[PDB]
Amino acid sequence: GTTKHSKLLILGSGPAGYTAAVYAARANLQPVLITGMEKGGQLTTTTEVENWPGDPNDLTGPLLMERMHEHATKFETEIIFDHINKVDLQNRPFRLNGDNGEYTCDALIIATGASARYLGLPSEEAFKGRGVSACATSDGFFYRNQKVAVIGGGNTAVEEALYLSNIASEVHLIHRRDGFRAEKILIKRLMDKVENGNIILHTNRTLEEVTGDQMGVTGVRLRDTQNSDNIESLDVAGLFVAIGHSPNTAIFEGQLELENGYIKVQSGIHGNATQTSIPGVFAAGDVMDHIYRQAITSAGTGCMAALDAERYLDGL
């Protein structure tokens, strides 16, 4: 095998890795970006995007990422289609092992994302991007004043249904258990909206099928209870699947501090905000943000990581 050294290596071709490459290339750092298997990242799995600021109309997730890729290659970012399976961050240079060879580098920006899980139903698959979504912040406004269902049982599902209750005429929260696995303040607010409002609870139910037409989702079929096969059909215009994300950090376990799988960064207002627990390794995007999880915040921390990486490489 091959070993290729780069002063700066970026892992990930989602908005954080591409923004980090355009800021690193205009800093004359000659970055190398490794795409991973999902070229373009999570935004290639959605259709219309209407919260990328400055793109009021006609943007989809694939066109934004095409534009980003064009932008990084205008500045001569070396793009490599590989995926990293093993890392050693405790010696210098850092060493990273991909399928197509070994990579070493003096500074590393990790922008590997935190992908949304789905139920795995073929009718859900059918409607992805036409009524089924895994991001309420992104897509909730398409359903303003319409009925919506959210499925899931942890923090993300209660957060998403809570967010959606301000936009949707009603929110149908679906879960298999007879309870939610969520933070206190989240459940208090949930019980408030259930009782004085907007959110309808459907505990002890599993989603059997998503129905719809040529245009999109029109319903969801549920089944069960504590002992029975009840079956409920809901009229709903959109389904938000909110069962959790998988931060792509298994390769970093035991090398970097993680907090529930997310990379912990130094953050703060005094600079070096994207530095991880190892000097010279920076993280950006959803891998280090389990709170906002948007393309624009990923591009902003991708910028910060490139400039933090430049200041580190220059001895500051």
| Binding partner at 24 among a copy of itself, ligand FAD, none, C-beta below 5 to 8 Å by kind | none
> How far apart are alpha carbons 72 and 88 in whole angstroms?
27
Contacted by 87, from ligand FAD, a copy of itself, none: CB < 5 to 8 Å by type? none
Residue 35's binding partner among a copy of itself, ligand FAD, none (Cβ under 5 to 8 angstroms by kind) is ligand FAD
* 310 in contact with a copy of itself (CB under 8 A): yes
Given a contact cutoff of 8 angstroms between Cβ atoms, the answer to whether 286 and 116 are in contact is no
User: Measured at the alpha carbon of residue 68, what is the angle toward residues 63 and 74, in degrees to the nearest 5?
Assistant: 125
Secondary structure (DSSP) of 138-169: HHGGGGTTSEEEEE-SSHHHHHHHHHHTTTSS
Q: Which of 131, 153, 280, 285 binds ligand FAD (CB under 6 A)?
A: 285
Select from 89-97, 163-171, 194-202, 216-224 the region that touches a copy of itself (CB under 8 A). 163-171
One character per residue 51-70, x = contact with a copy of itself (rule: CB under 8 A): xxxxxxx------x--xx-x
Question: Does 163 count as an annotated binding residue?
Answer: no
Helix/strand/coil (H/E/C) assignment for every residue in 21-62: HHHHHCCCCCCEEECCCCCCHHHHHCCECCCCCCCCCCCEHH
Euclidean distance between CA atoms 231 and 225, whole angstroms: 9
Q: Is 172 annotated as a binding residue?
A: no
Q: After which residues is the chain broken (C to N over 2.5 A)?
A: none
| Shortest Å distance, C-beta 125 to ligand FAD | 13
Nearer to a copy of itself, 15 or 219 (CB): 15
Residues contributing to the annotated binding site for FAD: 35-42, 286-295
Residues contributing to the annotated binding site: 35-42, 286-295
